[PDB]
Every structure is written in C-alpha cells, then in structure tokens.
Amino acid sequence: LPNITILATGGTIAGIANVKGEQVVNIGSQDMNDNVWLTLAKKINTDCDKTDGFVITHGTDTMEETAYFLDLTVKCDKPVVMVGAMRPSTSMSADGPFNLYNAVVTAADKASANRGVLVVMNDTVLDGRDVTKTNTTDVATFKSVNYGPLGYIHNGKIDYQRTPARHTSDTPFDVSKLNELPKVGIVYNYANASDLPAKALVDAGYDGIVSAGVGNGNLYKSVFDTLATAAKTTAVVRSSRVPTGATTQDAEVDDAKYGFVASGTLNPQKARVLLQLALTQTKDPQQIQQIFNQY
C-alpha cells in the first residue's frame, strides 16, 4: 500500500494506505503564526521523498489560512491534504474519524496529485485557495464558496470533476531557508470605521496591509485616505469582509491612481497570505497585482 504520513498540528480533531503519524506542534489554530507555517512547510518539503503523501490534522479556525500558505509554499508535488473536526473526538457523533478517513483516501488516490494543497471535510475534497470556514458550528462548514469543490468521496472512491487553474510546483515562493515573513495586517471596514487600526500598522512600518473592505472592497473614507497615503508612501491590498465573490478592479476605486492591489477572490486572510509571500520578492503594487491575478 502507499505510505501516507499524518502531520498533526492541533485542533479539536484530537482536542487504502500505510499510515504513519507525526505530531509537529500542538496548538489551537487560532494561535497559528508564521513560525508554525515556516516549520510546517519546511517539514513537508524535507520529507517529500520519504513518503507517498501527507495528511495534516489542524484547527478548523485558521485552516483556510494554513492551507493557502502551504498551497503557495509546498514544492512537494505529492498530495498534501488538510483535515480537521468540528466536534470533539470524545463527543458524541464525532466527525473527525470519517474526515481523517476520507483525507487518507484523498491522500492515497493517485488521481489527487497535482490538485494543489487540498482540504477534506465532510465527504468533500476542497481546493486550498477557495476553501473557507462558512459556519461557526456546522460540521459542513468548509466550502469553496466561489468555484466549488474538486470532488466528492464515496465508498473510498473520489469522483474528481474540477481542478484549480490558478499553486504548489507553479508558484515562485520558496521559504526553505527563510525564518521570517513580511508583516501584513488586516483592518476591518464598517460604518463610521475608525482609522486607529490602520494608523497603528503604518506607524509600525508594516510591510503590508490588507483591507477587509465592504462590498467590492470599498473602504471607509477615513480608512481609504490613510491607506491611500500609506500605499503611496506600505503595500495595500483591497479585499472584502464579504464572504463570497471577487474584489474587482474597475469598480468604484481607481487602484492605479492609488497604488492599491485588488485582492480578487482572496478573502482578507487569504489575501494576507499571498501579500506576505509577494513581499519577499517585490514591493511594487503594479507587480503585486500581477501575482494576485495568478495565485
């Protein structure tokens, strides 16, 4: 049988294949940070040749952030499948066993390769870029809200009907010998939104700022002004607190005039992930925007 290594990183999930298990760290994913991300990726890139595929048990809270980061830093072309649980393992009707079950299936399937980093939840294979946590409590919380799942799992078989075109081998981000990430913060937009948050990050000389805008990534006037001065003086990506849909160019915001970057379908967390890595290679908004159109 193929050999699949389970990498455990935390999450309620604790709190066909020849399966080996290693625990890298054990944290709530709400405390997820650059160091675990750099450690997790360096682990998988180092042990790529040593196994047939990886399954990663993780907290569901920032699962979408980790999955996107690995989707952009994993150079291992072998399947990397992320998995978690919404109910505790000791609790009744614990969902984790069959989730992890399905993840090993996904990681064992030879058809799964070259689909990037995947997330497997509730009988479904989700792509790392579009997966998001939809609901605070549901076991079916994970969804690709914009483009949808890649496949469904039944009786150990996967009917793959999609593959993402936007990852893994094909990305230029190499964090192998990197021990820090650029600083990227996220500011929320709302009625009468305060600029205090964005002013705080700019004054700290943050490399980047993501805007959790309203609608098509729009900003409150105070915020927009301040981010306009920062971008023109800090990288600023426009994303949206809106859970679904692209933050587009050519709507109500001339980004060129302002040197903003429209985040596309990337939500504020995922936009942050991509902005962080883009700032390891360039700081020009005109250049970054090209990165955001391909990843």
Next chain:
Amino acid sequence: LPNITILATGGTIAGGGSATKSNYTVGKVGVENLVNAVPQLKIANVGEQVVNIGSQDMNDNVWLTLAKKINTDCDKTDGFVITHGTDTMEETAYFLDLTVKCDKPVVMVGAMRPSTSMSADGPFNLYNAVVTAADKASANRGVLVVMNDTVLDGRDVTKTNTTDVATFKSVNYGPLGYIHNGKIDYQRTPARKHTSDTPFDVSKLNELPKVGIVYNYANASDLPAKALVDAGYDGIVSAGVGNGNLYKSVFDTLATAAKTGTAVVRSSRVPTGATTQDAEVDDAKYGFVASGTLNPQKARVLLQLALTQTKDPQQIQQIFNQY
C-alpha cells in the same frame, strides 16, 4: 393609496458610470430621478433627499438623522422606503431596527448595478420596496430589506456576494416573505426585539459611543486593539476566528481593556452561525460578551446602543441575548 416616504441616502441605486463599462460612482443621482425611473408606482404616492453618498461612508450622523426623521415624521406617512448603498445596508438596517419607534413599513433597498448600467436592478427593486412598504402586513415586522424580489429582516440580512444582484441573504434564519406580482406571502417574523421594542432612545443623541472592530487571523498584530484601547474607545468588537476565538496577542490586550471598563464583544469573521458562550472561551471569566448570531458589523451596532444605557458586561450580554 398609501403614502410612502422615500428617504434617499445615496447608493449604487443613485449611482452612474456608460451601460457597458463597469467603472461608476455612487451617491450621484438625486432621489427625484429614481422616482421617475420607476413609472409604475401610481401602488403608492411616492421624496426627500437626506444624503447622497456611497454607503461605504455611512456613519452615525446619517444613522441618527435617519432615526430622527422616521420617529418625528412617523404620523405623517403610511410607511417609508430608504434608498441606500448595498455595502452597509445590513448595518444601517440593523441600527434603525433598534432605534425606529414607528410601525410604518420601513423598507430599505439598494442596487448592485448602477442606474446607468444595462439591466439595472434598482428600478424593479425600488418597485418591490414600495410594494413592501405599502402593504401594512409588513407593519410590526421591524426594519426590512427588500432586494431581488425578497423581503428580509434587518437583523439577519447580510451581503453574501461582492457583485451578485442576488447578494442579500438572511443566512442564519432566512427571509420573511417573497414578492410576486406586487403581493407578499409572509411566512415568518423575527423573534428578537426590534424598532419600537428597544430600550434605545436616540431623540436626544447626536453621536454614538465609540466602538471599533478588530480582525483576527494567524499571527495577528495587536496594535489595532492597543490603538483602540489607548484611544479610550467605549467598545471593541473582535471579528474572531471560528466560534469567536482570538489570537493570543489580541486576546491579551482585550483582556486588559475589559478589566478596566471597555466593552468587549466576541463576534466572528465567520459570516454565518452564532458566536456562543461556553465553548473555548469563558466569557464570564474575562467580563466578555458573546455576540450570538450577530456578525461583527451588526455586533458593533448593538454594542454602540448598549453603551448608551449600560457599561456592565453582565448587562450587555443580555442586550445581545435579547436583540
């Protein structure tokens, strides 16, 4: 016919750009020109231009102006229709839902496409909004949002999509009724207290307590919360991850802010589902408030009003458990 007062605030309903191209500005078209875009209203007898702005610049002053209109002119009309930007309609609609002391159907409506666009959605939406406002069965339902042929309540309505004309959805509890042929089959009503049942009286308020929102994500910086605390904000909402949790940095500063009096509400960046008590965070232990089903923008609204009557974390927790 019923008398419906249309209060205009701006919005992509009142915005223009060419019909093809997608660049456009909002809070352009004056109300009077929107009335004319919908010849088929003489349903009701159409009005006032309060502001003409993109709803992304919506703020307490416009909120307070809106509430003061509706309550003072309640007896002079049969119901109101508020033309608004889609971006914060869920916020405005919730504030009015907590502050309007009238019964008249207060129905908010917007458009995802500019009025100059091809197949602009605003004319027929505004039609159904008037329809909604004119049907008195809409009375006693709180502040409503009528979008894409659907009637939604101000508490649960939220913007699901950045571009879809079907963008608005009551994701957690669902719509109140659907509109066909100028007729509404209402099958629900919201259970939380709204409008006339709220303990909030804005008649003598010209400004709201200061409440900001901090976002949560991996490795999150705590400088925004430290900035809001240092700024003496009355309330802070965290758009937490999952069931309202915080990154260690952010939880640290808010732990200290809450202990020295700041209202701290735990909500979720997660668009649907409740941020509940007794999960991973013991709210009674750090004097916090779980926001329940209220998303962060809506949680801000409730904490702002709550801070007009009380600064007790036990007391706020029930305001959030009741509205």
Next chain:
Amino acid sequence: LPNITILATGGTIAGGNYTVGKVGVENLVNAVPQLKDIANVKGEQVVNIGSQDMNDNVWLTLAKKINTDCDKTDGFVITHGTDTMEETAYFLDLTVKCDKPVVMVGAMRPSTSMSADGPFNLYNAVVTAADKASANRGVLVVMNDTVLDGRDVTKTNTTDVATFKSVNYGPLGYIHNKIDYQRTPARKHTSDTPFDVSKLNELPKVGIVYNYANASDLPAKALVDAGYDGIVSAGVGNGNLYKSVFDTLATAAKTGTAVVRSSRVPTGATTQYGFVASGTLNPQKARVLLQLALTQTKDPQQIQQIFNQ
C-alpha cells in the same frame, strides 16, 4: 424530568453498503446513555423500514398514535428515514391535534459507521422534544444541531449529514449544548388545521408527474386512467408543464381530478388556469397537502385557498 416517547419507523439511523431499519428502538436509545440525564425515554416500534417505502398506512397510524397518546407523555420524537421525512413531517404537521412537541430525527450515516450522526441527532431531538420553547411551532425535524419546520424542511443533498434545510424560509432555531429559537412558522399547523384523519383508514390517491424536454404523457394518463383524486405536476421553471402533459392534466382537471402545479426546481414558489399553484411546496409536500384537501373538498377554487393556508 419529562417523559418523551420515541416512535420508531426505521431509517438509516436504525440501519447497518448498508440496510435500513435493522436496529430496534431500544437500541437507538441504548446507544446514547446521556438521554438518562434529560428525559424519561420510552419507546415504540411503529414499523422498521426504509423510508423510501413509507406509505399512507404508516402516516395514518402515526397521527392516531400521537393524537390518542398526547395526554400520556410530554413530547414525542419520531426516528425516521431521511428520504421521506420531509413528507411524513409535513403530513404530521397538518394532522396532529397534539400541541406537545413532535420532533423527527434521522441519520445519513448508519449506526455502524465511523462518525455515526444518529446518536447526536437523537440526543438533540430529545432536548428539543423536552424544551418548552419548542411547543406550538408545529412538527419539527432536528438534524445536525438545528430545528427545522416540517413545512419547509427538505432534503437538499444526497449524502451530506447536513442535508436537511428549510430552503425557502430557513430554520426555526439552533441547538448548542438550550435552543436559540428565533423563528416560528406562520402558516397554520397541528391543532390549527381543518384536517381530521382519526377515522380514516385510507387517503385520497395523489400522484406526481415529472416534466422535462420531450416528456411522455403516458405517466399522467395512467394516473388519469386510475381515477386518481389528485395529480401534482413536478413542472419545469415556475410550475410550467410539457405540452402533452398539460393537455392530459387539462382533461383530468376538467373531469374532476384536482391538479396542483408545483416544480422540480428545488427552490421558490410556483406562483398563481383553474389549476392550483403549490406555492413554495415542492412536489412531494404539495402531494401531502393535496391529499388532505381532497378529504374536505374537491373544488379547485377551495383547494387553492388551502394552499394559501
């Protein structure tokens, strides 16, 4: 503690590829020791079958049981198959004269499976059946942490444990650890209906015909040939019908048969022909209501008023 009586009909929840309705009611209770902390659970095995074989006789039995024993218990939970629960639940919603909570629950995964969903479903069903806030909402279905109304709950997905959704108007409340009730159904239900099945041992014959391109009209004609009392059309779009099928139902309606227009399109109302528009009711739910109406009238005009209920 409250007395909750569990009425079992089968389902995957009681099943063990897999077979439905193998396990008995005491074993669905056994499997969750925690129910001892919440209610005094008693059980009755009404039938033990896959809900794809659910039928009128079982419907009539359930309604009479719930109606007769309403004064013997504090609330009922019905363990049931997920395939037709949306029908049974809506049937009970209109025929139960009991005001006490009547809660339906099921499983998408067998009792034998990894991550079997029935235990926590059945627990949450008993909680709901025990909560005083649940009474007077009509018949409820509790699946995957949520209280759903019998009228609007429908099965949205073929395999998901979260399949059940009130797709048009949404859930009534959410269950965590004790229910956040924020909605209540406005159409009339339970003790508020004009339908009395107590002394009925058969129901009027109602069938369903599907519409699609090139649709054959032989299925509609077969139901016409059988003198079926009612025909629901699973139409396309907003209750539209293929030409040949529309012709046959025109003849069926003209010779006395009730014809309700519904839609195969899973969401939204089929709107208001001397036909009956089903409104938001999908074909199977439209079927149950049309069945009941034909116990009180066969007037299409009065039948449409029933559907506006």
Next chain:
Amino acid sequence: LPNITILATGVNAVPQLKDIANVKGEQVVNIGSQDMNDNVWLTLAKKINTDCKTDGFVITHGTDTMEETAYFLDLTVKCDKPVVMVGAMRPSTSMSADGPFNLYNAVVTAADKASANRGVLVVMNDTVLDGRDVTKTNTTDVATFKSVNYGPLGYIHNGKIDYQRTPARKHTSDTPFDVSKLNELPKVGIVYNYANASDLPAKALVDAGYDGIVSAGVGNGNLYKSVFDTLATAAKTGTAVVRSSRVPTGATTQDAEVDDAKYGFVASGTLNPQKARVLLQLALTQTKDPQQIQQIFNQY
C-alpha cells in the same frame, strides 16, 4: 471583430453587442422551452456541427429546460468553437429585465477564445456555467442558474472573464455520440418517487416499450417498493434503468442500498433526473449494456 452566430429558439435592441461581435441572427425554431424536445436538439446539434463557418455560437433559449439542451449539446456538438447558451428570467418588458445584460455577457463569453474547449456553456446573470452541472435552482430568481455540485467556470466582470476552472468529464469532441445520422432519439422517460408512490407511471413506460427509464428516486437514488418492483422487471426485459434522485444536490452513487449490478441498474452519479435522461438516450445509441452504461455515466 469575430463573427458570432446567435441561434434563436424562442438583436437591434442591444446595440452594445456590436461593440463585441459581428452578429448574425437566425431563427432555428420558435418555441417555449417547456416544450423543448428531441427534434429541436437534433436540429440544434446538426446546425451547429455544419456551420462550425463562424467564430462562435450564442443560443437564446427559455430558461425552463435550458439545462437539458445545454447538456445534450454539451455531449453532441463537435465544434471546438465556443457555444454559449443564454435566456431571461424576466421578460424584456419588465422594469429590470435581465435579458439584455445576459445577452451582452453571452456574446462576450462566446467571443472569448478562452471559452473554447470548455464544452457547451451557459451564461446567466454574470457567470460562466458549464453545460453538465448547471441547473435551474430557483423558480423566479434572476440568479437561478448555478452549478450546485462542482461550481462555475468563471465570472464575467466588465466584459472580461476570469476562468479558474474547466469540467473534467468528457464533452463535445471527446464524446462518441454522433447525432448527425439520427432522425430520432431512444425513448427515455422519468418517474418520480415519493411516499406511497404509484407504479402506474413506470409501468406505462414499460408497456409502451421505452428503451430507457430514469428514476427520480428519494435520497441516494432509492425507490419506493412498488416502483422498484416495476423497474426491476423492466430491466429484466432489456430496458435500461438509471437511478437518479429528486434531491437537487449530490451524486446517486453505487454501493448504497440498491445492488445495481444484480438488477442491472445504473447509478446516475451527480446527474439529476432530466440530465440523466439526456445521457441515457445517447448511451442507448451505442450500447444497451448496464456495465457499459454505468461506465458511460462515470465518464460523462
């Protein structure tokens, strides 16, 4: 500009199309889409196949059965040029009639080459949808058409399409289905399952000797006992029987509660009843064997 042929089945009104393409109109038929049928399909496919010349096609169609025509054309059109279907949920007389911008975007999609080699497409309310998974979800909503199982191929903004997906099942040029030489399609009907379901509708189709029957089963393609009894005898008389589901989302899978291979049934996978009918009709043009039909249903 590319030459786009708009084939109408049910203009000067949108002048902004002419900013994107050189329109040819042509009235293939004049029908309500609830009356869509095999003959319009055979004509549509043969028309497109012969005129494949042009740079792309746009097909204006009623929304009610568009998902059937889209899938049928998805499997029988041999042209690799973009074939885009579009309709309106609101009449053109309405206040906010959606047809103009839909038609606009359909021409945009059809004129874009990135659209080629994605099969037959459906463009409705700002979205590029694949012919296989696209389905009509809501009775009146303008946002009704959506790919519920696997999702949209791209979104249209400002007359530009961000394609991020393509369907993996074989379509168009990779299919063995050639309707060019057919003047009729095999007779395949659909029966619904519900509690107490009557077997009279399915027996009517067996009595008329239909080649194929699709079951809109409950749950994972299950059948009421009466209907199963009937479909079993039909399979026993060489009839093809495909198990689908009235449930709008998810696959009707093998290895659940019905031993397909024992009875000779085919699980439809994610194909819903009307779509399963389209493929079974074409499947019956090449074979009448359940292993081969089931394979075909895992292939398309």
